[PDB]
Design a protein around this ligand. Structure first.
Ligand SMILES: C[C@H](C[C@@H](C[C@H](C[C@@H](C[C@@H](CCN1CCCC1=O)N1CCCC1=O)N1CCCC1=O)N1CCCC1=O)N1CCCC1=O)N1CCCC1=O
Ligand SMILES: CC(C)(NC(=O)OCc1ccccc1)c1nc(=O)c(O)c(C(=O)NCCn2ccc3c(N)ncnc32)[nH]1
Ligand SMILES: [Mn+2]
Ligand SMILES: [Mn+2]
Length: 178
């Protein structure tokens, strides 16, 4: 599929392999679920750019691990810090702020996805940070965790991915499929 080749020429190879394992872990095939394939890679890259901002030992990366191992770290973070165990696996834990973070990448309005992410968690303490494919962003308590320059990089990369999909005529199917 054309989407499949774009995702392979767009994201770095380890991001692609890490997405595949995340897909195969839930039965989804990147070769037919190609739109979900571009979404998992985009979400994976944002989480790794996000942890790249801040101090060296600031973030414990929960995403990209396998479910049992990912929970193993979450239970480890909880008993270490006393923070409540979330109902769903988050993406990162902020050692600087002592809270889990849920990263979200949207193709609709950032205000709708966060509203969609907020009622699902109900965990209150879990921080939520949302980015769009157009440059906006929305975070719990208006606390954006990272500095403006690190968030500007993520927004820049998202719009580049958005442009490259459109120049290849795959953006409309990607947008109209979320
Ligand atoms: C730690 C290791 C892999 C990391 C993945 C993560 C991604 C990192 C890739 C590096 C290379 N850079 C940096 C320059 C460009 C590049 O490509 N970045 C950061 C920028 C974008 C990107 O891609 N990092 C961070 C530490 C080194 C590394 O690779 N992961 C995978 C999930 C959990 C985790 O920490 N692990 C851990 C165990 C399994 C495994 O593989
Ligand atoms: C796009 C999606 C799934 N909404 C999602 N957005 C996030 O922002 C996020 O953080 C997660 C997450 O963290 N964990 C989910 C792990 N999960 C569960 C089912 C599944 C699947 N069918 N394919 C790949 N992964 C899957 N998920
Ligand atoms: Mn996740
Ligand atoms: Mn997420």
């Amino acid at each position: 599929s054309h989407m499949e080749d774009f995702v392979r020429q767009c994201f770095n190879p380890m991001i692609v392999e890490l997405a595949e394992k995340a897909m195969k872990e839930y039965g989804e095939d990147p070769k037919i679920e190609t739109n979900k394939f571009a979404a998992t890679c985009t979400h994976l890259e944002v989480c790794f750019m996000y942890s790249d901002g801040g101090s060296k030992h600031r973030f414990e990366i929960i995403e990209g691990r396998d479910r049992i191992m990912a929970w193993t770290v979450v239970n480890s973070i909880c008993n270490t810090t006393g923070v409540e165990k979330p109902k769903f696996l988050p993406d990162l834990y902020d050692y600087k702020e002592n809270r889990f973070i849920e990263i979200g990448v949207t193709r609709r309005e950032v205000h709708i996805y966060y509203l969609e992410k907020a009622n699902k968690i109900k965990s209150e303490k879990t921080h939520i940070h949302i980015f769009s494919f157009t440059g906006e962003e929305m975070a719990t308590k208006a606390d954006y965790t990272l500095d403006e320059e690190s968030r500007a990089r993520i927004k820049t990369r998202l719009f580049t991915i958005r442009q490259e999909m459109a120049s290849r005529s795959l953006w409309d199917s990607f947008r109209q499929s979320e």
